Amino acid sequence: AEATDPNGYIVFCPCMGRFGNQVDQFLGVLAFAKALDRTLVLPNFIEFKHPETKMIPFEFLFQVGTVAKYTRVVTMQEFTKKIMPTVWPPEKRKAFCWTPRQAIYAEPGCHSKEGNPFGPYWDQIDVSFVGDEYFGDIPGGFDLNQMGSRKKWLEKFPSEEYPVLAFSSAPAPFPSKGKVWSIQKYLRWSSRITEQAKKFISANLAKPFVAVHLRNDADWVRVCEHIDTTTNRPLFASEQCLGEGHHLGTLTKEICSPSKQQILEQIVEKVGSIGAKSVFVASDKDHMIDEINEALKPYEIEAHRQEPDDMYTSLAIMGRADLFVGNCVSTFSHIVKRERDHAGQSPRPSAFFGIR
Amino acid sequence: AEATDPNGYIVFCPCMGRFGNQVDQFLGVLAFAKALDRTLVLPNFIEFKHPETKMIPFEFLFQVGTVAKYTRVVTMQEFTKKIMPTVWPPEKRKAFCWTPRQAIYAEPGCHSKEGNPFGPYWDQIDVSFVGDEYFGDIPGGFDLNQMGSRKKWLEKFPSEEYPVLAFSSAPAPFPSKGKVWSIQKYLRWSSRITEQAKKFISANLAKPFVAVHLRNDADWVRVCEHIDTTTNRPLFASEQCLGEGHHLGTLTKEICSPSKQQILEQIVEKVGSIGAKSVFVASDKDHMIDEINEALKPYEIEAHRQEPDDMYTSLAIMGRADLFVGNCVSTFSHIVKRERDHAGQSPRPSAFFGIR
Ligand SMILES: C[C@@H]1O[C@H](OP(=O)(O)OP(=O)(O)OC[C@H]2O[C@@H](n3cnc4c(=O)[nH]c(N)nc43)[C@H](O)[C@@H]2O)[C@@H](O)[C@H](O)[C@@H]1O
Ligand SMILES: C[C@@H]1O[C@H](OP(=O)(O)OP(=O)(O)OC[C@H]2O[C@@H](n3cnc4c(=O)[nH]c(N)nc43)[C@H](O)[C@@H]2O)[C@@H](O)[C@H](O)[C@@H]1O
C-alpha cells in the first residue's frame, strides 16, 4: 500500500479500561472514522498481565473482512509497514486530545505516553510524538453530534498537513450511545476463537445450554454499592436492559451485584425454562461451580467453566449459548448482548440478573 | 454569609504548572466566572517544595478588594467556612472535567485527586468528590467563545442542582488569549509583598534601575531547542512580544533562550539607555551576578538579587522597575509585562531579550 488514502488515517490507543470498555469505545471509533471518511487503523487491544502490558492485534480476536464491511480499515501491521513510512514520518507525529493537562507521573500536553498502558502501546509500534493538537474547540469533540462539527474536523485538520489523527485515548463516548450498538454486527470472532469455542462446547456443554456472566470482584461490588436509585443515572452498560436514560425502570444493587441466592434461583429457573442440559459460567473471579452444581443436582445437569479462563473464548461461547443471562451493568456482558442481538438474521435470547 | 449566591459558585484547582501557568489560567477563569455570573472562589495557589506541596491563599499574594472590582469573588476561607456548609454538603460534591479518563497512578473519570498537587489541593479544604460531570459536549468547553455555549452551561448545570461547579483544573485556555491580559490590572500585590519589594529596593537598588528576568534551567533550554521557526506557532507566552498568531515576526531560540553574551550585551545597552544606577536580577537558577557585575564594572554599577530568591517579591520588584527586560516565552515574565502594561494610568517600559 504505497498508494495511501488521500483522506488520511485515524489511529488510537484503546487506553481506557479493560476489554469491555475498549470494545464499547471501539464501536464509537468506527462510527467516527466512517463519518470523517478517514481510514481507521485497527488497534491492538490491551490486556494487563501483572506486570506485562500485552498488546493483542485486532485480527487475532476479530475478522478484518467483516469489520471492513462497515468502514475502510487497515490493520496495525499494514499501517506500520505500508502506510507510516510514506505518510507519517517521525517529525509529523502529533498526538490528539481534548486539552493540555498536567503530567502526574512536563510541558502541558496530552501526555499520550505517560503511564501504563499509554507508553507501552505507542512503544510497541515505535511511535514518539513531537507535538500535541487539541480538539476541545470543535463542538462536542469527537461526537459529530453538533452542526459544523464534522466540517470543523475537516477544516481544522485537513489530510494534507494532518494525514494521521493519532488519539491518546479512543475518540468515542463512554459508555457507548445506543445508536452504535448494532455496529457489533461487524465484530466477528477470528477463526481461532470460534474453533476454540466450538471445541469447548462439544467437549463440555450438552445442548441446549444456558451461559451466565458472573461479575463479582471486590472492586465491582464497591461500585455497585454507590448506586443512587433516586437520581437513577446510567452506570456503564446499564441502558442495555433499562433502555436509554433508564426509561424502563430503576437500576438497583440487585441488578448491579446479584446476591448468591438471586443467581442460583435465576439459573435454576432459566435451566427449567428451556430444558437445559448444561450451564456455562464465565466470571471475573468466583464461577460458583459448586454452588450451581448443588442447585442443579436435582435436574441432573452441571455447570462448566474454562480452565484456565480465556475471556475472549468465554465471550464467544456465551454468544453461542441457547440462552444468555448477563450482568446489565457490565460492558463485558454488553458485548454478548450486542452480538446476540445483531450477529445473525434474528436476535438470540438474552436475559439479565435481577430483571424480568 | 449564610445568604448565598442564587447563581452559585465556581471553585477550581490551579492544578497545571507553576505560578506563571497558574496566573495565566486564573485570568481566563476570572473572565469565565464573570460570563457565567457565578461567584468565583479564589484559589489557593500552589508551590512545590521537595517534597511538600504548599497551598498559598490568594489573599497572601494579591488583594481581594482589587480583584473584586472585576467580578464577584469569595476567598477560599469564606467558601469553606460560610458557604460550603449550607450549599455544598459532601453528597453533592461533583468534580467537573472535559471527559472521563483512565487513572494512571479506577472507574473512568476526572480523577481530580490523583497525583500531586491534585489530591493535596482538595485534601487541604476537606473535599472528596462523589461523582463526575463532563462539559465536553458544550461547544468549546469553558471557552464561551461559541453561540449557545453560555446558555448551555446555564441549561445543563443550573445552580439549583449544581450550586458549585468544581473543576479538576482551571477552566481556562493555556496559554492565555490576548483578550484576558488586561485583567492583570485587577491583580494587585498584597501589602506584605509590596512592603518587602519596597524595602529591598531602598536597601539595594539605586534608582533608576533595570530589572531582568533570566530563565535558564536545564528543562527550559530543552523546550527552547524544539522551536520550529518554519511553522512558527505560539509557545507559552511568546505572543506577548510577537503579537497574536506571531504576526510581528519569528520566534527563535535566541528569544527563547538568550545566550550569556546576548544577555550581557543587552543589559549593558539598557543600563546605558536610561542611565541606570543598579540592576535587579530574578532567575530560576543562574542569576549571573558576577558576569553582569564584570560587564557593569565600567559603569560603576552592580547587579543585585534576593537572598534567598522569593519569586513573588521578585515579580513585585520587577513590576516596580524603571525598565524591565524579560523572556518573551515565559509566563512568569508575562505577569510582569501585563502588570507594567495595565496596573496604572499609563504603560511602564518593558523589553524582551532578543527583540528590538
Ligand atoms: C469498575 C468498572 O468495570 C467495568 O468493567 P466491565 O464493564 O465489567 O467490563 P471490562 O471493561 O471488560 O472489565 C471487566 C474485566 O474483568 C475481567 N472479566 C470480567 N468477566 C470475565 C470473565 O467472565 N472471564 C474472564 N476471563 N475475565 C473476565 C476481564 O479482564 C474484563 O475485561 C470497566 O469497563 C470500567 O473501566 C470500570 O473499571
Ligand atoms: C517548561 C514550561 O515552562 C513554563 O514556565 P514559565 O512560563 O517560565 O513560568 P512558570 O509557570 O512560573 O514556571 C517557572 C517557575 O520556575 C521558577 N522561576 C522562574 N523564574 C524565577 C525567578 O525569577 N525567581 C524565582 N524564585 N523563581 C523563578 C518559579 O517557581 C516559576 O513559577 C511553565 O509555565 C510550563 O508549565 C512549562 O513547565
Curated annotation (Swiss-Prot), chains A, B:
Belongs to the glycosyltransferase 65 family. Catalyzes the reaction that attaches fucose through an O-glycosidic linkage to a conserved serine or threonine residue found in the consensus sequence C2-X(4,5)-[S/T]-C3 of EGF domains, where C2 and C3 are the second and third conserved cysteines. Specifically uses GDP-fucose as donor substrate and proper disulfide pairing of the substrate EGF domains is required for fucose transfer. This is GDP-fucose protein O-fucosyltransferase 1. Substrate binds at R18, F19, G20, N21, H213, L214, R215, T331, F332. CDD domains: O-FucT-1 (cd11302). The lineage of its organism: Eukaryota, Metazoa, Ecdysozoa, Nematoda, Chromadorea. Pfam families: O-FucT. It is an enzyme of class 2 (transferase). It comes from Caenorhabditis elegans. Keywords: Carbohydrate metabolism, Disulfide bond, Endoplasmic reticulum, Fucose metabolism, Glycoprotein, Glycosyltransferase, Manganese, Notch signaling pathway, Signal, Transferase. One of its GO terms (cellular component) is endoplasmic reticulum. It catalyses: L-seryl-[protein] + GDP-beta-L-fucose = 3-O-(alpha-L-fucosyl)-L-seryl-[protein] + GDP + H(+); L-threonyl-[protein] + GDP-beta-L-fucose = 3-O-(alpha-L-fucosyl)-L-threonyl-[protein] + GDP + H(+). It is found in: Endoplasmic reticulum. GO terms for biological process: fucose metabolic process; Notch signaling pathway; protein O-linked fucosylation. Manganese is bound to the substrate GDP-fucose, but is not required for enzyme activity. Its main location: endoplasmic reticulum. Disulfide bonds join C13-C15, C97-C110, C224-C256, C241-C328. The gene is pfut-1. Its EC number is 2.4.1.221. GO terms for molecular function: peptide-O-fucosyltransferase activity. Monomer.
